[PDB]
């Protein structure tokens, strides 16, 4: 978690959905996602919602089960490529996962008003990176 | 010409983060832990996806809409694993460069099968690392 991170920002988020993407630099991927994730689920009925935790350290971002405290999935820093949040509805917030073995998926989430909150606490920890460089 | 493009029915247990290493059990474990979990919390649902294996990743896909919801490179698939008394789970650890992270799966007793699908696309793959 952040035993050695200054940077530990806790956020509730709800899951909405996951697209393998282009591999590219521009933040448009995030808002088509978006688009495609919010109209799929409408069309094929798909209300449900399970609420985790989004933890945001200086190394990774987490998804902890609000249960178990388990962490599911992690996402190091360097491979979140891009982060967004829609400035017609700040609820939501999603970002790419770049992997290299090239392969990039991006993830979308809601949350309780807090795109631009969690848009901030990810740029401080990529801000962080950038510096210790 | 003849490519590797086997699918698979495959529902989602769960995963989580596991420690970096070649440990071969680490499957295992996780496989004990999801589980445990799932029955201690009371735990029914478990999303049904399609696996596609290539020689390029895994991908699970939508079964009603064909969307990739998620895509594994295979280079980054250190281990996977079934049981052969119970082939009705299967699990891999996908390792990112080090951050690992283990899914497990039920199966439609198809574990061994899944297994030799994910073996045949990896020597398919050293095969043109080789060339």
Redesign the interface.
Known sequence: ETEDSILHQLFIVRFL????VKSDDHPDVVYETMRQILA?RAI?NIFRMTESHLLVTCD?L?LIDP??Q???????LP?VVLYATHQENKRLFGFVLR?????S?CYIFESNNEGEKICDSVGLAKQIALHAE
């Not at 959905?17 to 393998?20: D, I, L, P, V």
């Not at 388990?70 to 190091?76: M, S």
């Not at 992997?99 to 392969?103: K, M, N, V, W």
């Open positions: 959905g996951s697209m393998e799929a094929h990774c987490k249960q178990t388990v962490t599911r999935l992690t996402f190091p491979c992997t290299s073995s090239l392969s998926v």
